[PDB]
Amino acid sequence: MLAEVLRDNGYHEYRARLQALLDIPELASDFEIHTRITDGFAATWLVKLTERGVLTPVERDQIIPLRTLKSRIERDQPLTVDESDRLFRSAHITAMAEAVFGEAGKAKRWLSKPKERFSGLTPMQMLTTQQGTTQVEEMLLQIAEGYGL
């Protein structure tokens, strides 16, 4: 979130993409971002992501199982803090990857393919842990330092 540079602009691109995916304003402060996650994202937000092609069906139930998701939709419930956190983590890496690569298609393919530095794991499977997300972020930063390698 504030681990961003890329000659000042790149962060604006990240916030702009982040503002498309989860409706998070670019001028929102960090704590306001954290309260939006703890407040809980709308359950319908996740369905729209797949319709627009941002999330696989399977990465989506990595965030929340489907039957519970439909129960939240029907019972008009927001996603819980843990489900909202996992959704933000996916959107955050997606917005970051879109910023470095510059295109949604190329960024998503990079996030979904296995990588030799993760011993066959894809960047998305590294997002299951705090350390793993850091490794994906640094790899993206190293890619940015070489202008989309």
Partner: protein, 145 residues
């Protein structure tokens, strides 16, 4: 002139700015924040980083920064009321000062005390090597709390 820094470091590399932002800069550029008096450096840390005197880190070092009075200084424009509540304003001005690399020092006003000036120090500027630094130890007769 005499400047003062309070940090965990006895140098002026300021490489932590490559990762973390501040009120006068966005991350990705080395920078050192300094004051014009030892209490000026201390008050800024305790208030802005919310450190009680009992929790003051044993790793903090008070650094005396000696620069010749001919050191190059940039100048801020006259800021208007409400300036301290605009991160866009203060981050941009410090970013432009660090990136332009026209001067070693940028005097900036304090957001918590009137008639108080703090300083941005750019390690990338060639005049950064003209500083003489030394640590002033915290002693039993000169320490917080």
């Amino acid at each position: 002139m005499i400047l003062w820094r309070i940090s965990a470091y006895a140098d002026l590399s300021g490489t932590g700015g490559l990762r973390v932002s501040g009120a006068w800069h966005q991350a990705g550029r080395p920078v050192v924040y300094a004051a014009t008096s030892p209490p000026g450096a201390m008050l800024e840390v305790l208030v802005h980083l919310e450190i009680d005197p009992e929790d003051f880190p044993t790793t903090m070092r008070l650094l005396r920064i000696e620069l010749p009075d001919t050191v190059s200084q940039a100048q801020l424009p006259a800021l208007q009321p409400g300036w301290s509540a605009q991160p866009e304003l203060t981050r941009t001005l410090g970013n432009r000062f660090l990136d332009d690399c026209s001067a070693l020092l940028l005097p900036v006003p304090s957001a918590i005390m009137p008639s108080t000036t703090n300083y941005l120090f750019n390690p990338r500027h060639p005049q950064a090597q003209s500083a003489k630094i030394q640590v002033e130890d915290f002693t039993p007769d000169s320490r917080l709390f």
